[PDB]
Structure formats: structure tokens, C-alpha cells
Design a binder for this molecule. Structure first.
Ligand SMILES: COc1ccc(C(=O)n2c(C)c(Cc3cccc(O[C@@H](C)C(=O)O)c3)c3cc(OC(F)(F)F)ccc32)cc1
Ligand SMILES: COc1ccc(C(=O)n2c(C)c(Cc3cccc(O[C@@H](C)C(=O)O)c3)c3cc(OC(F)(F)F)ccc32)cc1
Ligand SMILES: O=C(Nc1ccncc1)c1cc([N+](=O)[O-])ccc1Cl
Ligand SMILES: O=C(Nc1ccncc1)c1cc([N+](=O)[O-])ccc1Cl
Lengths: 248, 259
């Protein structure tokens, strides 16, 4: 019934607002008419004075990137549990859906903070030019570049938060994660989410044909770059004890 | 609102179940004979000890008891570290403090979780499939004949409170979020979180144990016992480092063992 799908869509959007402090609406405002910009080395070390952070440079930026991801994982976990029927699944399965899902969702939402020329950082207090990041030493200079390419493609679909809120729910409820014990309910929820997302895209983007389909195709792009992302970390194993424990 | 607190109690229980595979519930079942779980091999002498390698999954004996148990400590730290990240606000804190809160919280959380595996006669070992008796341990060599006994005495006193895993989960969190740790940069946001956790604990206790007069207060005092356990532990550890310089401490434990 289209009435309840519209309710599901509003429920998730409200939960997403609570779970994610820096919305896409907010990020896009900041990128388009003031956050300190980081375009080279001098601007960076200036930027710890302006925007306060935690305790060489290529590695320091990589690491602080992990910090944020751990922060992100908690936001996604908290959002995940507001998905109807999620907490009711077998606890191991919830843990399995998150394990394989948080990456795909992080890159999805990193797209909201990026454009052609760089990426907002630190709750949007900052902006890191895309040029400075590729200026970084091999292989560091090559880490965020593949994401920039995915983001600009992805942002071309002109999704808003209310779209993204359902979309990422769909990501979490993937019935093909290894090690799932009871896939019936997982796929039951996903189809519901898929319905809500199909209607949402229609009402919210009437003039955009088959956007639903085009969006589902991007989940190919996501899983590809997630694979390629883990293998890029697994050439930086070619490189505290509690810190490595907090970030494993 | 009470409703915000129950929600926090549930979230914490939920992560606790996800991060610690041997709950107190599983452990009380093994320790009584419940047919939800199968029965442990008991070790009480060197002979029983020695078929236990054939029986249950796993250099003289008292040393590699201490070594086996040592690597078990490491795994626990990882789980507590895993648990800590689920604590609303913990990973947003300053990174130097996160390390700080772990550095001091972790042993107070071990002996709390280790109590779950103990009775007045011994301790489950090897994920539950073993049971090493108190006496056997107390009878080990001159230095290694005093490791476990104080944790036994705490565990006996502590298990008196009759907490379950859903209580422990909040209380384990209150331990981590201790602003009074040495070297904390921003004590203040730490204490807004603990202030909240303690509110959650209070409610959870009053509801889960509606007859246990002052369980909350009584439970906060048990943090006193915990801190004394850690100090006797650490100093007795430096004996071993000097008795047996052939013996190595795992680095993650060695870093926690600072100050
Ligand atoms: C809910 O999902 C997200 C929440 C936060 C963020 C976020 O702020 N990030 C930003 C701005 C970034 C980009 C970035 C670049 C340089 C330093 C960064 O760390 C600090 C400055 C920070 O952003 O707080 C962050 C980011 C990277 C991340 O790891 C990666 F995706 F690469 F696997 C994860 C989250 C990241 C992204 C997704
Ligand atoms: C809350 O997290 C945990 C706390 C304790 C344990 C745990 O299993 N332990 C057990 C059963 C023990 C008890 C024990 C005694 C002898 C050998 C042991 O190790 C092997 C043989 C095993 O566990 O199978 C384990 C234990 C001891 C520890 O070191 C100490 F803190 F005491 F210095 C640490 C953890 C220990 C696991 C998780
Ligand atoms: O990938 C990065 N961080 C991680 C770490 C662990 N898990 C997921 C993401 C990263 C690397 C760089 N860099 O400068 O190479 C810049 C920004 C972010
Ligand atoms: O304390 C012990 N292990 C360590 C070591 C260092 N850091 C933390 C925990 C221990 C020792 C014995 N024992 O009888 O030798 C038995 C059980 C546990």
C-alpha cells in the first residue's frame, strides 16, 4: 500500500537526520555559498590551529581518516537499528549486515561531502582540495582519487537525504552477505525498502526516468571500489598498541 | 525520560552480547549442570592437567598456565576495546583520551568479567570446556601461587550481588567512562557520558532487581575492590619479569602496563 511506503520513507528520513549530524543538504550549502580550505602544506598545518583535531603528513591524514570512519560506523549502527525489523533479526545476522555494509555506506555518504575539487572534512569545518590529496606520496596520493570519480558520477543523480535515507537502508539489508543465518526476513525487509525507494524516487524525481534502476546499478560501482579499497589498505600493511586495537 | 535510559540499556546489552562470547548466562549454565550446555573437564592436579590437552582445546606447568592465560587476556582486551566503541560517545572523544580510558579501564573490566566465570571453587577455562579448581591454582609455585587467589576473593564477594549480563553491560561501560583517570585531556565530556551511563545503571538496577536495596550504591563501591586488585596484580607482575627474564609479555599488555 502506497500509504505505508510513504510512512516508511518518512520514518527512515527522520531517523537519518538524527543519526547523521552533517546531512547532504547541509554539506551542499557549505560547498555552494566559511570552511577553512586545505590546498597545500602550509594551509594544512595552519588548519590544526583553526580546526582542532587529534594527535609525517601523508600518514597523518590517512590515519585521521580512519578515526572518522570509526565515528561513521557508530552513526550507521545507530541508524541501522531504526530500520523496522532490523533489531528483530538474529544478532549474528545484524552484526553480519553491518560488517559488510558500513563500507558501502561510508562511500555513499562521502559522496555527499565531495565535489570535483575536494571534500569537506571535520563536520564541514574544512575542505580538502582534491589536488592536494593526489599531491600526496605514493600510494597515499592515489587513495581518495578513485572515490572522487565515484562521487562525481554518483552525485550526478542529484539524490537528496530523503532518497539516501531509504537507499542506505537497502544497502544494509543485503541478503547476500557471507555468513547470514536467516535470509528470509533480511530479504523480506529489503523488498519493502525497495518498494519505498521506488516510490520515493518517483514522487521526488518525476522527470528522472528509471532513476531507481540507475541507482541500483551504482551498487555495482560501490562494491567494486570497496573491494579495491580494502586491497589498497592491504598494501599499507607494509608499514599505538591500543590505537591499532581501536582501529582494526 | 526513563524511556531514553531503557533504550541506552538495551543498546549496551545488545553490544555486550555481540562483543563477549562467554556471557555470565552461558557461564552459570555450564557451572551448574544445565542441559543448555555440556559439562567441563575439571583440572585439580598435574595429572588431570595433562590429559586436558587431549580433552579440551588449549616449559613447566605453572609458567605456561600463566602464558596461556596471558594470551587469553589479550583477546579480552580486544573484546572490551570492541565493546567500548559501541558506547555512545566513546569514539567521538579525543583520541588520546580513548587510549587513556582503555589503558586503565581494561583490567577493571577483566576482573569483572572473570568473576562471571568463577565460583567459590574454581574458574571456567578454555571458553567453558574446562574448569580449573581454586586449590590447584593456589598450590602453584612460590610466585604463581598468588596470581588468581585475590581475583577469587573479589569474584566471590562480587558475585554476591547477583548481577546478570544486562546489568554488567551498563556497569562495564561506567568503568570505561571514568573521568578520574590520570592524564585525561578533556575530563568533562567523559563525565557527561558517565553521568548518563550511571543514570542508566540506576534505572536498570531498580527495575531488574526491584528488591535489592541499594544495589546501585553497593555496586559502585565494588569499583574500590577492583582498583586494589589491579595494583596487587601489576606489582606481582614485575616479580615475574624479574624472576624469569626468559619470559615475554605480549606488547599490547605491556603498553596497557604503563605509568
Ligand atoms: C556516515 O558516513 C560518513 C560519516 C562521516 C564521513 C566523513 O566525515 N569523512 C570525511 C569527511 C572523509 C574524508 C577525509 C579526508 C581527510 C581526513 C579526514 O579525516 C578528518 C579530517 C575528518 O574528516 O574528520 C577525512 C572520510 C573518510 C573516511 O574513510 C574512507 F572513506 F576513506 F574510508 C570515512 C569518513 C570520512 C564520511 C561518511
Ligand atoms: C571480560 O573479558 C574477559 C575476562 C576474562 C576472560 C578469561 O577467559 N579468563 C579466564 C577464564 C582466566 C582464568 C584462567 C586461568 C588459567 C588459564 C587460563 O587460560 C587458558 C588456560 C584458558 O582460558 O583456556 C585462564 C583469565 C585470566 C586472565 O588474566 C588475569 F587477568 F587474570 F590476569 C584474563 C582472562 C581470563 C575472558 C574475557
Ligand atoms: O582510506 C583512508 N582511511 C581509511 C582507513 C581505514 N579504513 C577505511 C578508510 C584515507 C587515506 C588517505 N590518504 O592520504 O592516503 C586520505 C584519506 C583517507
Ligand atoms: O595474571 C595472569 N595473566 C596475565 C598476565 C599479564 N597481564 C595480564 C594477565 C594469570 C596468571 C596465572 N598463573 O597462575 O600464572 C593464571 C591465570 C592468569
Amino acid at each position: 500500500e502506497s500509504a505505508d511506503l510513504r510512512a516508511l520513507a518518512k520514518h527512515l528520513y527522520d531517523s537519518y537526520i538524527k543519526s547523521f549530524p552533517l546531512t547532504k543538504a547541509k554539506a551542499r550549502a557549505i560547498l555552494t555559498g566559511s570552511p577553512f580550505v586545505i590546498y597545500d602544506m602550509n594551509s594544512l598545518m595552519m588548519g590544526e590551529d583553526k580546526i582542532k583535531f587529534k594527535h609525517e603528513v601523508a600518514i597523518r591524514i590517512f590515519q585521521g581518516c580512519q578515526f572518522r570512519s570509526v565515528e561513521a560506523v557508530q552513526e550507521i549502527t545507530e541508524y541501522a537499528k531504526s530500520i523496522p525489523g532490523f533489531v528483530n533479526l538474529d544478532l549474528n545476522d545484524q552484526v553480519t549486515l553491518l560488517k559488510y555494509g558500513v563500507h558501502e555506506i561510508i562511500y555513499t555518504m562521502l559522496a555527499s561531502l565531495m565535489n570535483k575539487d575536494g571534500v569537506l572534512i571535520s563536520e564541514g569545518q574544512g575542505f580538502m582540495t582534491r589536488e592536494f590529496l593526489k599531491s600526496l606520496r605514493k600510494p597515499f596520493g592515489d587513495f581518495m582519487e578513485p572515490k572522487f570519480e565515484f562521487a562525481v558520477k554518483f552525485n550526478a543523480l542529484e539524490l537528496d537525504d530523503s532518497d539516501l535515507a531509504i537507499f542506505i537502508a537497502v544497502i544494509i539489508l543485503s541478503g547476500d552477505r557471507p555468513g547470514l543465518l536467516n535470509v528470509k526476513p533480511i530479504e523480506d525487509i529489503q523488498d519493502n525498502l525497495l518498494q519505498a525507494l521506488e516510490l520515493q524516487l518517483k514522487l521526488n524525481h518525476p522527470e528522472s526516468s528509471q532513476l531507481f534502476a540507475k541507482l541500483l546499478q551504482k551498487m555495482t560501482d560501490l562494491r567494486q571500489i570497496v573491494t579495491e579499497h580494502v586491497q589498497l589498505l592491504q598494501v599499507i600493511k607494509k608499514t599505538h598498541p591500543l590505537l591499532q586495537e581501536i582501529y582494526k
